[PDB]
Design a protein around this ligand. Structure first.
Ligand code: MET
Length: 524
């Protein structure tokens, strides 16, 4: 059924400035979003900041500033960061928003009315930096430089907690979560993280503390309805951002104008894809579903958990994203982060490797190809020629180009953006090979009729590969299409995934004396 494609990033704690990693998480959200928009679908990509809680309040206290002023200042830093990265996110949500607060209270009330929240105690370990309850099996010894306990997850300092808290009956949802994981084998990606979650829930689930004593949080939280002494767990608050996002009417400015009663009215909920980091799996794959199940809400379709940490600066080389983007280009940096990093994440992010892939792939494979097929030397009429008869070699390359969109489509749907990039560049490599074999520079004179067929296939290969690379290189793809002189209408739509969609006779865009699409960086 047609609904709005809803893709989300996590909302980041605002205890410290934005850094790489927030950027990576949001980039993944932005690319998935962008790709569905080139497919012609309706999209709503969501991002933002997690502003309540003990972690954030104690960061604000440690800088001698009011939480109100602090959450706002850092929230601003994130927005500026994401503006300057040239994303295309539809809305930036803050948990301090008053409509957000309303949704949390509605969601809470439903959980309670369902008979799934009881007054209890939590006596156990807690990681303030992760806002995470941990069992004794998940802690160990470590340093402050004093002897203390630390979380096995993150290595952050853990503390004992003994509070009367409101408890959520998570243990009641073990069997339904297990049905869900199995009946929908694609709900968690990558597959090995799906197996991790299933093992965790198979071992058993305790109930979860969903409130905290107000003293503990420095009164920087959403109050529990019907009990001002308590505050809603920062994570239940935080996870509710997705439901709140799905219910906000937003204007062209990006300001929210209205909170609708029923999520169905905007056709966004539930999320089609939640992009998260490996460090926040349990909240999304265990807790969030259980809350949704309790309240009677539809579950998300997919949670993709990438190989990075969502939130530790220390981690993995020192790497400012805006500084790099000015050093290497924004599109190029995004390409590199997406190409280099898989799910297990064994990535080499050195300037050596960054230069290798820029020079090698972007310049020599893609850049090269675009200049060859638009050169006054080769393309003397500066147009899309009409092709003659196709040789078997021609047809071998045409087939690859024809098959590319189906293959790239599947990868983006996984989603595995790395694999989709590899698939497109595999075709780009083939096109270069074809072009070397055919030596069109010689054909201009030898055989003009042959050059037409070869030039046409090259142009159409370059077009289609660029369409599929457009969620990754949004600014450069526009330049490419301008050089090829592709009409705007043909720059999106599944219709334009088809080989031959730009007709012969189309005129190439005008050249400039100085322009180069990707400039090779100093050899070091
Ligand atoms: C609902 S996603 C919340 C993520 C968490 N606040 C973090 O920054 O890691």
């Amino acid at each position: 059924v047609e609904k709005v494609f809803f893709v989300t990033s996590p909302i980041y704690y605002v205890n410290a400035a934005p850094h790489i990693g927030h950027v990576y998480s949001t980039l993944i959200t932005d690319v998935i979003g962008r790709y569905h928009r080139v497919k012609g679908e309706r999209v709503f990509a969501l991002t933002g900041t997690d502003e309540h809680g003990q972690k954030v309040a104690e960061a604000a206290k440690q800088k001698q500033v009011s939480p109100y002023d602090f959450t706002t200042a850092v929230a601003g830093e994130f927005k500026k960061c994401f503006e300057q990265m040239d994303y295309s996110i539809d809305y930036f949500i803050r948990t301090t928003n008053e409509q957000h607060k309303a949704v949390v209270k509605e969601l809470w009330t439903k959980l309670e009315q369902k008979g799934d929240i009881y007054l209890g105690r939590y006596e156990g370990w807690y990681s303030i930096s992760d806002e995470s309850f941990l069992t004794p099996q998940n802690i160990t010894d470590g340093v402050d430089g004093n002897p203390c306990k630390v979380s096995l997850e993150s290595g952050h300092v853990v503390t004992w907690v003994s509070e009367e808290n409101y408890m959520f009956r998570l243990s009641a949802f073990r069997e339904r979560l297990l049905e869900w994981y199995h009946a929908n084998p694609g709900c968690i990606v990558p597959e090995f993280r799906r197996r991790e979650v299933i093992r965790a829930v198979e071992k058993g689930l305790p109930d979860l503390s969903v409130s905290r004593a107000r003293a503990t949080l420095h009164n920087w939280a959403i109050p529990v309805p019907g009990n001002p002494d308590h505050c809603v767990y920062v994570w239940l608050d935080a996870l509710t951002n997705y439901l709140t996002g799905s219910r906000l009417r937003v204007d062209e400015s990006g300001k929210e104008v209205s909170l609708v009663d029923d999520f169905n009215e905007l056709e966004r909920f539930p999320a089609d894809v939640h992009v998260i980091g490996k460090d926040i799996l349990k909240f999304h794959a265990i807790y969030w579903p259980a809350f949704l199940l309790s309240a009677g809400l539809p579950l998300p379709k997919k949670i993709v958990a990438h190989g990075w940490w969502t939130k530790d600066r220390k981690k993995g080389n020192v790497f400012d994203p805006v500084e790099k983007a000015e050093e290497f280009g924004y599109d190029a940096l995004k390409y590199f982060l997406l190409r280099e990093s898989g799910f297990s994440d064994d990535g080499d992010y050195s300037d050596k490797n960054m230069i290798a892939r820029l020079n090698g792939e972007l310049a020599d494979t893609l850049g090269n190809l675009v200049m060859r097929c638009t050169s006054a030397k080769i393309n003397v009429n500066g147009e899309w020629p009409s092709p003659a008869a196709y040789t078997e070699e021609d047809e071998s390359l045409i087939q690859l180009i024809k098959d590319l969109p189906g293959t790239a489509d599947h990868y983006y749907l996984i989603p595995d953006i790395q694999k989709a990039i590899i698939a497109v560049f595999d075709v780009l490599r083939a096109i270069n090979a074809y072009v070397t074999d055919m030596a069109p520079w010689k054909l201009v004179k030898t055989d003009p009729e042959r050059l037409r067929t070869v030039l046409y296939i090259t142009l159409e290969g370059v077009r289609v590969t660029t369409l599929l690379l457009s969620p990754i290189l949004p600014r450069k793809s526009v330049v490419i299409f301008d050089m090829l002189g592709v009409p705007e209408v043909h720059r999106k739509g599944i219709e334009n995934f088809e080989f031959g969609a730009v007709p012969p006779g189309t005129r190439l865009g005008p050249a400039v004396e100085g322009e180069v699409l990707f400039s090779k960086r100093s050899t070091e």
